[PDB]
Amino acid sequence: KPRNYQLELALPAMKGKNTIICAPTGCGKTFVSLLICEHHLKKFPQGQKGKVVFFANQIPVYEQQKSVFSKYFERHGYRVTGISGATAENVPVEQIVENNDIIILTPQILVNNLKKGTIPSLSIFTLMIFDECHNTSKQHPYNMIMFNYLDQKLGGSSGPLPQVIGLTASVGVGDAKNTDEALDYICKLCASLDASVIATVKHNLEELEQVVYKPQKFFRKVESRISDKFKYIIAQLMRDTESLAKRICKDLENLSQIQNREFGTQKYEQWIVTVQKACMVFQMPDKDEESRICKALFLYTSHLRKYNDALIISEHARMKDALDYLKDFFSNVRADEIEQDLTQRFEEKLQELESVSRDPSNENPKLEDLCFILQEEYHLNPETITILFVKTRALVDALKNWIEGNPKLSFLKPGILTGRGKTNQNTGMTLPAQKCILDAFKASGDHNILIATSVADEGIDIAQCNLVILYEYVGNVIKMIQTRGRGRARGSKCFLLTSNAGVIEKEQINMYKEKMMNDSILRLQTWDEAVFREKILHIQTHEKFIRDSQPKPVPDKENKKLLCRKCKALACYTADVRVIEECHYTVLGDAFKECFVSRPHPKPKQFSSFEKRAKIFCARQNCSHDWGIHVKYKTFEIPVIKIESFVVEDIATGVQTLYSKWKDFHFEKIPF
């Protein structure tokens, strides 16, 4: 049965108004979506019918809502379907939309069909439901859909527009400093969704509270480790590696605009990257010492990265975790004359590092305050379900081994949850491997605590956790309100454990931003709905004028060279390059086939017309630098290269340029 606060949220939508529904995570917005959609489809007379589209930002939420809407409306005589990236190609989308009454969609599927013209205008729909509507922002596919909606509303083109409904737990305030700034960000968000009403729970607040409780937050400010015998060693290997680069490249300190860099910092990381992109554009006339000097500096900068990474891992986890990170790196580097030198310089101090990592007196004080908290809660409630958010995927693996390798935590049964990772790198965690652990992360399951990276807005619902711990982890006001839904029962707790005062302070800001987020909405609801619809109209118009008044570059028909970024080897020319569907780039000619090898692809996914088959690398002198992928297009199998892997050398001028995207590289682009 529907609750009274669920009916209260659906009331403005059931009255036909474009409504943003702001409610706490876990209060059952999905039921509210059904209540609105069940009312929308029954109000039409016999000679008419309605069509609803539901937008989902992730495949798990896509399959979830597709199954919920299917089993709720099938008996009532409505057809539900869905179009995701898997079933989007070679299918008549226009027929699928017309032959079904409810279509759960991924927003990119609609954005691509509006451009292709297969879906001419949004008039085909009578109701659009945006899940996590706060994402209707700068360039998200939600806003691109609303740009199509607004251009038809403001232009002279008539045609019935669909009702727009948005669900979120927080509309946000942006970078607002006071209530007036917060009120304008909310109004501009309502203008992006054409919303006339913000539906919140006001009359049944007592019922909503007895269903979703607010976890009490605890800020735990700690101190960093005092003496770092691990850093004194690793900082020496970096100074050693910094010197070996100097012998090859004089005045290396002038290669970056970053001064006074320090080991184990984000500023050093920006520095070790700036120099890396500068050593690739070196032009030696020998063209063989070029492949020697550049490749040598690329290895030094690559090794200096893992050292700087380990120094950060040491500051947030055990010295042993930063040790095993480097051990895996050199074990990956092995199986070159320069790599063997940097390995011997490391293997020398390896035994000394292990005698420092094993020293029980060099314990991380932050992990001892995390151990104290875990010991306390599981001593009070031994059936505690805990989820621990960390910043990097290396920190997930670090705290997992730390929990499994601590006798004081033998009561813990830790699990892992990371993102899917990059599509062309054997990293991350596949979707079945994700769902296989979230089914094991229960009070009756195998695992007692989950260590996770950041998660999408609300995502699939996992077991309620009476303990949530944020380890050096801070976010915006929206994410703060969504992590409350991790535990909704009475007695849920949330710990923010960090050694940085700016992290504690950012959460205090977010708490004040939420106050401004509510008080702005509270007084926004006290306006005449006609005045509100008119205020957003000039916003809708002024945001369109700016968009309508915002650059087609002139290409460079001069042929260029494409060299490997690591060994400077000639791979192909721009004359051999053909473009596919204005997005993807391949190489012709039989000379390019002699320059790359192929490993089987770790994630053989599929996009517009491509079947991933292999990854391609450089082959000259065993460079193995990633160049792209080898896919199977409609007819044949071809390589697909990324310009990020290469350096563009000009033939006559001899200049070497670095391009990060193909759109920023202008040359003769022949269709394939």
Add this chain to the structure above:
RNA sequence: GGUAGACGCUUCGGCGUUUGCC
């Protein structure tokens, strides 16, 4: 292969991390 968001850094063009979508 192409891309979207969030967070941090920025010497304001980007860099890194992280999570996604086609």
